[PDB]
Amino acid sequence: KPITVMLLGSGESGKSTIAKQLKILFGGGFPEQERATHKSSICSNVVTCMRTLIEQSAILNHPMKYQPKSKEFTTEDPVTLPFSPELVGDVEALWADEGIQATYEESAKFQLPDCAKYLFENVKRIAMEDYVPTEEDLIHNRTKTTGIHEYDFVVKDIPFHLIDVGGQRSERKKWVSFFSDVDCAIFVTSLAEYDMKLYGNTSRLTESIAVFKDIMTNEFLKGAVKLIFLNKMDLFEEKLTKVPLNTIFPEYTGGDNAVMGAQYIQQLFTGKLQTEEMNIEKVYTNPTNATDGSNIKRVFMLAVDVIMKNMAANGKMR
Ligand SMILES: Nc1nc2c(ncn2[C@@H]2O[C@H](COP(=O)(O)OP(=O)(O)O)[C@@H](O)[C@H]2O)c(=O)[nH]1
């Protein structure tokens, strides 16, 4: 029987990106027909993300040199099926325009999907008539996984079964207790959300923390190893330079140091629990960059050993 792993997290923690990444690395990836289903949302995101920046450049007074010609940037209507011929061209001009670039740097804050820059840098290839999304596009594109995804992979000749629990907090609860005999629960959280508000909970950070505190006391998850992926370490490093951590936690003295800062956030989730960073009741932690296949491969590897060691010591095996 396969080793079972359950992914939990808040929204926009990147847990769905982790799951696609493991299917690519250890599953069979995604076949052309599965990939082609993502064409419309990717094509749509190209336009909507850029409308966002144009609108924000007005709200934030960064005048534009360039002026869009295409049908697509004269309307708020949903995005049609084949792009107008001029769409490609003015996406490239727009992204190179001084005012748009200035607006992009003030990304904190309005709400710009993480995939924006990737979409723009890839527009020549996305706007082609015969374009079929690649696995890398699927990694970077934003999708809403209304939540219950299963699959199997193998790692170093050992069967794994992955349960990806999505949905509202209210249905997430339903599924956690449905699955029996889970060997490992992986909690994913976005480091870059430390400054984002909400309104029960006030901020994204406190909402994630309370989710995690659930996992730690959930009686159906006793027996399961608890791992935390502090995700979006890349985004967090950079974000720290525009929104310093002590503007959110004035009781913090570590400054620009993304390592010390990630630890500070990590310690807010784990309190008095014993913890262990896999990079050299007990909670294992590791920062991650889910859009980096190489990073997720190296990191899940450490994880397999932690899961195996633990199971051996708990009288479970294979
Ligand atoms: N830059 C960066 N983006 C990420 C990372 N992890 C996830 N994302 C992005 O976050 C967006 C949505 O995250 P998603 O996997 O759908 O979250 P979930 O479904 O709520 O668990 C996608 O556009 C991803 O490309 C990361 O480590 N780095």
Residue numbers in the entry: 22 to 220, 223 to 303, 318 to 355
Give the original sentences from the paper that presented this experimental model.
Here, we identify functional heterotrimeric G-protein subunits in Entamoeba histolytica, constituting a signaling pathway which, when perturbed, is seen to regulate multiple cellular processes required for pathogenesis. Like mammalian counterparts, EhGα1 forms a heterotrimer with EhGβγ that is dependent on guanine nucleotide exchange and hydrolysis. Despite engaging a classical G-protein effector, EhRGS-RhoGEF, EhGα1 diverges from mammalian Gα subunits and cannot be classified within mammalian Gα subfamilies, as highlighted by distinct structural features in our crystal structure of EhGα1 in the inactive conformation. Here we demonstrate that functional heterotrimeric G-protein subunits are encoded by the pathogen Entamoeba histolytica, including single Gα and Gβ subunits, and two Gγ subunits.
The three switch regions are ordered in one of the two monomers in the asymmetric unit, likely due to crystal contacts. EhGα1 exhibits a highly conserved mode of nucleotide interaction, including the dispositions of residues Ser-37 and Gln-189. The guanine ring is embraced by the conserved NKxD motif (residues 254–257), with the hydrophobic portion of Lys-255 packing against the planar guanine ring. Unique to EhGα1 is the absence of an αB helix in the all-helical domain. EhGα1 also harbors a unique 16-residue insert in the Ras-like domain following the α4 helix.
